[PDB]
Design an enzyme around this catalytic site. Sequence first.
Site, PDB file in Angstrom:
ATOM      1  N   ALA A   1      23.639 -78.040  -7.644  1.00 53.99           N
ATOM      2  CA  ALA A   1      22.789 -79.641  -7.330  1.00 53.99           C
ATOM      3  C   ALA A   1      23.481 -80.299  -6.131  1.00 53.99           C
ATOM      4  O   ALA A   1      23.001 -80.602  -5.581  1.00 53.99           O
ATOM      5  CB  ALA A   1      22.706 -80.295  -8.216  1.00 53.99           C
ATOM      6  N   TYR A   2      24.569 -79.901  -6.093  1.00 49.06           N
ATOM      7  CA  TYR A   2      25.729 -81.354  -4.947  1.00 49.06           C
ATOM      8  C   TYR A   2      26.260 -80.890  -4.425  1.00 49.06           C
ATOM      9  O   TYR A   2      26.976 -81.490  -3.178  1.00 49.06           O
ATOM     10  CB  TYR A   2      26.298 -82.154  -5.969  1.00 49.06           C
TER      11      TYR A   2
ATOM     12  N   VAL B   1      29.712 -67.574  -4.242  1.00 50.21           N
ATOM     13  CA  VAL B   1      30.214 -67.295  -5.510  1.00 50.21           C
ATOM     14  C   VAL B   1      28.534 -67.906  -6.239  1.00 50.21           C
ATOM     15  O   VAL B   1      27.808 -67.652  -6.934  1.00 50.21           O
ATOM     16  CB  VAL B   1      30.468 -68.275  -6.000  1.00 50.21           C
ATOM     17  N   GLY B   2      27.762 -69.320  -5.792  1.00 50.92           N
ATOM     18  CA  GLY B   2      26.990 -70.082  -6.123  1.00 50.92           C
ATOM     19  C   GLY B   2      26.297 -71.557  -5.226  1.00 50.92           C
ATOM     20  O   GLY B   2      27.245 -71.983  -4.378  1.00 50.92           O
ATOM     21  N   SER B   3      25.482 -71.606  -5.177  1.00 56.70           N
ATOM     22  CA  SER B   3      24.339 -72.408  -5.163  1.00 56.70           C
ATOM     23  C   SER B   3      24.089 -73.774  -5.720  1.00 56.70           C
ATOM     24  O   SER B   3      23.817 -73.224  -7.096  1.00 56.70           O
ATOM     25  CB  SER B   3      23.182 -72.220  -4.151  1.00 56.70           C
TER      26      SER B   3
ATOM     27  N   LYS C   1      34.570 -75.606  -3.605  1.00 57.12           N
ATOM     28  CA  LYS C   1      32.797 -76.177  -3.135  1.00 57.12           C
ATOM     29  C   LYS C   1      33.171 -76.923  -2.526  1.00 57.12           C
ATOM     30  O   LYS C   1      33.502 -78.258  -2.223  1.00 57.12           O
ATOM     31  CB  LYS C   1      33.012 -76.660  -4.347  1.00 57.12           C
TER      32      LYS C   1
ATOM     33  N   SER D   1      28.010 -76.300  -3.113  1.00 61.32           N
ATOM     34  CA  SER D   1      28.269 -74.688  -3.003  1.00 61.32           C
ATOM     35  C   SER D   1      29.302 -74.487  -3.071  1.00 61.32           C
ATOM     36  O   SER D   1      30.518 -75.317  -2.844  1.00 61.32           O
ATOM     37  CB  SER D   1      27.200 -74.060  -2.311  1.00 61.32           C
TER      38      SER D   1
ATOM     39  N   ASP E   1      27.738 -84.564 -21.221  1.00 62.61           N
ATOM     40  CA  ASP E   1      26.789 -83.322 -21.405  1.00 62.61           C
ATOM     41  C   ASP E   1      27.394 -81.755 -21.725  1.00 62.61           C
ATOM     42  O   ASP E   1      27.209 -80.424 -20.252  1.00 62.61           O
ATOM     43  CB  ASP E   1      26.141 -83.398 -19.875  1.00 62.61           C
TER      44      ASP E   1
END
Length: 345
Positions: free
Chosen positions: A35-36, A31-33, A54, A38, A150
């Site tokens: 900062a902490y 799905v995605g990579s 994750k 994948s 944030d």
Amino acid sequence: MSLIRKKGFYKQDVNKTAWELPKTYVSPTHVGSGAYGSVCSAIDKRSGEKVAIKKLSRPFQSEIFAKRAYRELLLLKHMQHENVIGLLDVFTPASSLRNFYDFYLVMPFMQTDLQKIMGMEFSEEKIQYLVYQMLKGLKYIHSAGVVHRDLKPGNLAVNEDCELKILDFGLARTGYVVTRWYRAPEVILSWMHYNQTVDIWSVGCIMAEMLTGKTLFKGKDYLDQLTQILKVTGVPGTEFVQKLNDKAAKSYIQSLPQTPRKDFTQLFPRASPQAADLLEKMLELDVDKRLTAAQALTHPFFEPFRDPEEETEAQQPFDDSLEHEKLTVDEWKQHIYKEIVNFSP
């Protein structure tokens, strides 16, 4: 006993990186990579349901990273709300502390996020639905003593049915700065202490962008962003400036052209009266006048969707006795290890 990995785990490459998964989770798909870690999607073969997994990447590389990993695990476990991302499972392939290098979070799968689907004008109905869900999730985490700080389109996960979940809550921390388009002025300028309404500013900014298709506030630096904000909010007067803890900021404001707040019905010329009114009450510089999540949920803008029964609160405050402890990476690692062992759906 000593093993390479726990019984019933398999090795598979996902996005050219090695994953170790329990046999119950199959067909891992990138799905995605980030900062902490994948993320992949997988099927829980016990139910046929698609989940997100994750994999934390080197969470024990530093005290900063290890403490973050621990706090995140605690936060995700503590919250139980439909509009707040939560945990279905947590696991490590490790057989002992010796081979404990990482761990994995299993969460509901959400197809996309608001950043990806933003950029043109949404129907007011769609805005009502999405903003209502954001506010429910905020009411909940706020009721546990946790703010986002944030909130942005990218951490609002959405599915094709516009179901929403808040991501990455509770974890906020050159001549250059990151984009802060959605951050509250009191955070950017540290000109008074924030309360939980810090996140309601963000909702206002998100809702404005849904209404217009345009980011409400940008800016190359803090003062430029402030200038952009004041074009919308007006230059605040005596009741507000008296509350500032930053005397130079107060002086700056008192020295500006004292431009009145614009009519939001003209600033947002296609917005309904209710939409404009809610935006007026969320995009408020005074942190004591700004709506809370619970207050916003009562606004007429949400009448079509409002269900008080869904606007739940956390029964218990988020309570991490170790939040302000300075510990070695190994100490944080041991706490995390124990928290995973102790987990139960």
